[model samples]
Target: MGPVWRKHYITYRINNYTPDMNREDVDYAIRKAFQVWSNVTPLKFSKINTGMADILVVFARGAHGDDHAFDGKGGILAHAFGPGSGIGGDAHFDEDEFWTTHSGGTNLFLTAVHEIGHSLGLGHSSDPKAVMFPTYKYVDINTFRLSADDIRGIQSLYG
Candidate 1:
């Protein structure tokens, strides 16, 4: 079976920031992204300023170590590992993408929300409407809602 967290709460740490957006905005985006899943499941996420966390959020460009080296600018905005320790459940964003706070460019909130689904043990949904879908597409952050497929998938593991 795919990995899932054994506990109800998961802690995350921001390992780095993207210059595409300001520090506070990036922080807010990450928090809101976690809230997207927490809103529909028993899982809760907390942020830590130091030490290791269940998830480590980071931004890198080109070949930055992991097996999945980011494709600059257009392909693969981000990726996250399934629930586990020592690099698992961690999320990495492509620094090449224009991380945005609005609808103009690749919205950080949307990508992080999708990647977090992976971190939470949810795989790509066949449903295109689902946030867990493998492809990255832009959606309005101000009025975004998780598709029913997404809710169902996360709840199966966390509820």
Candidate 2:
């Protein structure tokens, strides 16, 4: 292989919130999003409350950490680390996007599911029905689960 690879054991830390939204509500949304994946297959993920996790879940403004930073207002609302070691599997949300549980903005659950796809080493999908599609769209959180292609893809790696 051209580049060295390592498996990531993901953990996450949610940063402080500056919005009016309830913290528990935010936690529920993020947990539900990740649960969708763990429920379907043998893969397992745990949340770390005391220390650093493989995934550092944060809501940040533009240029927070990595080179591919958020735009701070629109377009890209979030991004995630693909499968690898250390910072791999982390997920970052752009606080600039109207983060909400309603319409007129990028749906939190929808974006989380998409970013989680990236955390699992998935790339953008051409299939409009697929959850791994790169673009954002409003969708039902409970109903959106891993696509068959997505299941096959992840299983191919970690299985």
Candidate 3:
């Protein structure tokens, strides 16, 4: 467990987007990802187009001054920080990887949900079906559900 967001209502800002993803889908995917958490917790999320926000989402290739930097395609395709100020709660992606809206290439929605879990101060679950699983797995976005592990994990912090 890490630092959870102290506030119930948190905002995110997309600093930039990936070229591989639909501009509109980026917004929808991110919103829906946050919705997954909101569905199981009391927290509310909103997107801000200007100024600073609680979480900052960005897409960049290797070595963007994130200290950790992107490790090419496969491993660490995306990542996020735990709750805090500035870098805290921010979600970042590897632009080098091809991303898709649905079950095509690397699914953005899947990655977003997982990373958002980290942004919300949860870590990987041992359960393979859990969204917070360390490895990337595919599940239909329309049919997605929070595994028991995921619900218990998030709710443990915000319940």
Candidate 4:
């Protein structure tokens, strides 16, 4: 796992937005994803549209220039880097996957919630309902809850 972030207030910049979803929902999903963690910990996150940020959010197709080239479509929904500089803490989503705001496709809110957990240095959780669980499943976003496993795992690092 990447080292936990030493800074309490972290920043992220959306290097690019996905063509698959509207801009408003894209930002909303990312913001809410961060809130899901910060609400339980002392960590804080703010978004920037210019300059480099602590974390960079990106969406791209296969082989989008990272060492971990994205697999087309369903192979890999998304992934993130552990806390640090450069590529550290960055989150990447596979553009091939149908990213959506709701339950119709790969739910962006849920995906962001999981990937952002990685960015904050939490690894996959064994509990199926935990946000950090590597497995992906779509649930009603408004009704989603962070499992205890996920809460304490994140708290162990940042709270």
Candidate 5:
């Protein structure tokens, strides 16, 4: 709640791809993730094919420039910065994870949804059902919905 984008529209760039899945799958996950947030807020997201964007998405692992330093695969699936310039608003995925489009592995779409929340200035929620919760859990993607806490969090900032 401390920071928010000054405008309604935000742009993102996919800096790289993960070899664990096809490029199309990664692209689909990213788009769907953004849609999850856009559904309930005035904020909007668009992808950029080139040049800088407000948010930069990438797949990286282990001390990938930031001080966070991914703890292998299971510990931290991904992390993102809050709204800002430079390193802020960037999301980094732990490439060590076995990313998948389905339940057999870590669902990229689900992870992205959570991380994008952070990119939009959302912090961890106490509600276990929330996408902004500190831990990751598997849910039926087809039936996924943001918890009430999540809705309130985003709406309070962007509504």
Candidate 6:
């Protein structure tokens, strides 16, 4: 069977951080990533201290949660689970790289855009131009814009 999304309203809490960047910057980038989706659709995200956010965001190194783990610098930097109950829609960042909003870093904005795609019940797209593409390509803040296919895919589900 296909994945099922309860569309449960939830909020995220910043638990901790990796040594690569400031906590506030990471927090802000994470929030901004969700805002991109909320702004384009009826979806909404809020930062709160209580309750289990449907999409739990975290930073860990090596094989932390999933079988597909980060392989230091050049490998996969992060991944997320599809929509479901419990651990559904959770996102994990590979702590191996220096995640930053500026250049020469992992480009938090771009990675967040991709991770949020999975959190919203979407999967990787064949379109390399799509943010939902599985590979991590370094991009500036301007490179993080969502493609038409991305919008169409998410809208197909939540709409």
lDDT of each: 0.91, 0.72, 0.90, 0.91, 0.93, 0.77
- Pull out the clashing pairs in model 2: 11-54
Question: Model 1: residues >4 Å from true position, as ranges?
Answer: none
Candidate 1 versus truth, CA RMSD in Å, comes to 1.0
Q: What local lDDT does model 4 show for residue 27?
A: 93
Predicted candidate 3 versus true structure: per-residue lDDT over 101-134, tens digit per residue: 8776789988999999999999989999899988
Clashes of 3: 0
lDDT (tens digit, per residue) of candidate 6 on 1-159: 246365545566655676788878888788889888886777778786556667788888887766776788767788888877666778888888788878777888789888877877788888887888788777667546788888888888775
Model 5: lDDT of residue 19: 99
lDDT of 1: 0.91
By summed lDDT, the worst window of 10 consecutive residues in model 3 runs over: 96-105
Q: Candidate 3: where are CA atoms >4 Å away?
A: none
| Model 2 per-residue lDDT at 25 | 71
TM-score of each: 0.96, 0.86, 0.97, 0.97, 0.97, 0.88
Look at candidate 2 and tell me the lDDT of residue 40.
65
Regions more than 4 Å wrong, model 2: 1-9, 18-20
Q: How well does candidate 2 score on lDDT at residue 112?
A: 84
Report the poorest 10 consecutive residues by lDDT, candidate 5: 1-10
lDDT string, candidate 5, 59-78, tens digits: 99898998899988688899
Measured by lDDT, the strongest candidate is: 5
Model 4 residue 130 CA deviation (Å) reads 0.5
In model 1, what is the error at residue 44, expressed in angstroms?
A: 1.2
Candidate achieving the largest TM-score: 5
Minimum summed lDDT over a 10-residue window in model 6 is located at 1-10
TM-score, prediction 1: 0.96
